Amino acid sequence: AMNKTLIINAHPKVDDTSSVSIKVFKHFLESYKELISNNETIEQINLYDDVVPMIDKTVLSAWEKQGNGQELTREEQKVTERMSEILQQFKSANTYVIVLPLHNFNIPSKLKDYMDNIMIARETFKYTETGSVGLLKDGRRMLVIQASGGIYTNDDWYTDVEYSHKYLKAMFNFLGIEDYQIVRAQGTAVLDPTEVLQNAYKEVEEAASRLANKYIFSLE
Amino acid sequence: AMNKTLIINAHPKVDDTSSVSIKVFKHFLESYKELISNNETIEQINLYDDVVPMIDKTVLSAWEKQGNGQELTREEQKVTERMSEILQQFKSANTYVIVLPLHNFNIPSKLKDYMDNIMIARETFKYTETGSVGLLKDGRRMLVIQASGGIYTNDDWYTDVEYSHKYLKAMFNFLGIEDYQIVRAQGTAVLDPTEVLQNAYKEVEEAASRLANKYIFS
Ligand SMILES: [Cl-]
Numbered sequence: 402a403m404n405k406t407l408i409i410n411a412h413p414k415v416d417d418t419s420s421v422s423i424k425v426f427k428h429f430l431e432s433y434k435e436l437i438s439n440n441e442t443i444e445q446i447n448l449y450d451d452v453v454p455m456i457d458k459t460v461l462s463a464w465e466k467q468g469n470g471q472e473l474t475r476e477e478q479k480v481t482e483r484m485s486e487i488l489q490q491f492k493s494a495n496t497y498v499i500v501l502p503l504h505n506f507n508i509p510s511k512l513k514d515y516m517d518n519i520m521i522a523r524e525t526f527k528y529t530e531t532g533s534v535g536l537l538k539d540g541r542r543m544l545v546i547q548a549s550g551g552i553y554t555n556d557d558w559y560t561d562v563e564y565s566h567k568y569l570k571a572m573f574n575f576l577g578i579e580d581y582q583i584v585r586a587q588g589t590a591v592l593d594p595t596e597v598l599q600n601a602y603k604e605v606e607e608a609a610s611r612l613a614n615k616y617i618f619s620l621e
Numbered sequence: 622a623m624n625k626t627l628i629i630n631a632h633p634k635v636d637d638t639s640s641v642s643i644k645v646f647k648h649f650l651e652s653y654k655e656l657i658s659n660n661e662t663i664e665q666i667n668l669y670d671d672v673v674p675m676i677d678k679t680v681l682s683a684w685e686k687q688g689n690g691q692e693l694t695r696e697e698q699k700v701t702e703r704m705s706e707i708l709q710q711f712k713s714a715n716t717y718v719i720v721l722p723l724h725n726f727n728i729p730s731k732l733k734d735y736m737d738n739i740m741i742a743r744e745t746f747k748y749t750e751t752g753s754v755g756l757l758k759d760g761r762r763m764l765v766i767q768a769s770g771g772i773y774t775n776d777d778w779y780t781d782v783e784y785s786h787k788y789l790k791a792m793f794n795f796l797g798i799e800d801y802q803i804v805r806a807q808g809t810a811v812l813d814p815t816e817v818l819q820n821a822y823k824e825v826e827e828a829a830s831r832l833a834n835k836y837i838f839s
């Protein structure tokens with residue numbers, strides 16, 4: 402992986418500033434940009450604006466043919482080329498930032514489609530005899546920024562059904578990405594909006610320092 | 622009352638029986654249709670063929686305007702009316718069958734879009750001052766038919782990452798659907814394909830018997 406950070410924006414509203422997770426992300430990005438070395442570049446994929454191919458009849462057909470050395474059709478060629486772009490972009494980054502609203506206790510549908518683009522055998526993982534293993538075991542880092550109506554840190558039912566987080570941590574650990582943090586801008590339905598924003602802002606500042614490996618300090 | 626079984630087909634191939642989960646489902650359906658009474662309507666929604674709106678900018682705008690009493694655009698009306706049809710169909714059923722392949726340890730993306738259509742506050746659940754509670758606690762039944770390359774019943778890593786089942790069970794329990802069964806047509810990557818099919822077949826026949834409440838022993 403290069404000196405490159407990749408933003409994976411899973412918010413249906415893409416760039417709308419009034420989104421809690423988008424506000425927190427923008428605060429993160431401003432903070433991060435101050436601390437990163439000059440060798441670091443940044444890319445962003447917008448899952449609800451950019452083309453992120455869904456697994457359909459055509460993709461399954463393309464994949465079956467590729468496994469038989471068979472020629473692809475025009476549309477099979479075009480979709481797989483885009484999936485290849487998305488995968489190669491993912492592999493090129495050693496720092497990942499996922500931004501999502503938690504709706505209905507799982508990752509956004511388009512984030513599932515994105516997972517379907519980047520979890521590829523012989524590329525990000527491989528099959529063996531006792532199962533499979535991840536191929537990206539080289540010290541990459543992941544930060545998840547999640548805004549939610551409810552609160553998930555009370556070790557109750559909500560904690561148990563937070564499948565967005567459970568799934569993402571699991572999959573990325575599988576791939577080899579073991580440095581994982583989630584910032585929960587949680588309780589937007591029951592807590593003070595300025596309280597949510599300010600608590601999340603502080604955590605993503607600390608995350609920015611960590612990821613950039615810098616410490617920032619001011620006298621009072 | 623009209624009893625209704627609703628088939629939620631989450632396979633991208635829709636009707637192609639080269640797919641294990643669809644093969645098993647078709648086997649289930651034939652057995653069930655032989656056992657049900659004349660008070661039983663069967664309907665099917667194909668998530669990869671029928672229109673299943675995903676939550677996007679337009680849907681969010683529509684929902685905001687709805688919660689304000691603001692008039693919807695022609696486009697916002699179109700999506701919300703389709704989402705309404707999907708939700709009313711879901712609520713009208715008392716038996717559910719979900720058919721899915723396991724791709725990447727979670728529900729198919731279109732099945733998430735479907736969940737986003739059917740989990741609606743004041744409709745299938747409601748908020749309290751305590752938290753949340755389902756509104757469908759009335760003896761409904763759910764059967765999941767899931768095909769997978771790996772085997773998930775060994776209480777190992779695979780069991781720990783079976784988020785398709787974990788999520789679906791959790792969500793439908795929450796809604797009030799506590800009568801839940803999953804049939805795993807599993808190990809397609811490692812077992813004899815005839816063994817996989819035959820084991821799954823036996824399981825769905827027994828499921829069909831349980832759901833129709835007509836057991837025929839030989
Ligand atoms: Cl948000």
Ligand SMILES: [Cl-]
Pocket residue numbers: 640641642643721722723768
């Ligand atoms: Cl299948």
Ligand SMILES: [Cl-]
Pocket residue numbers: 790801802803
């Ligand atoms: Cl179970």
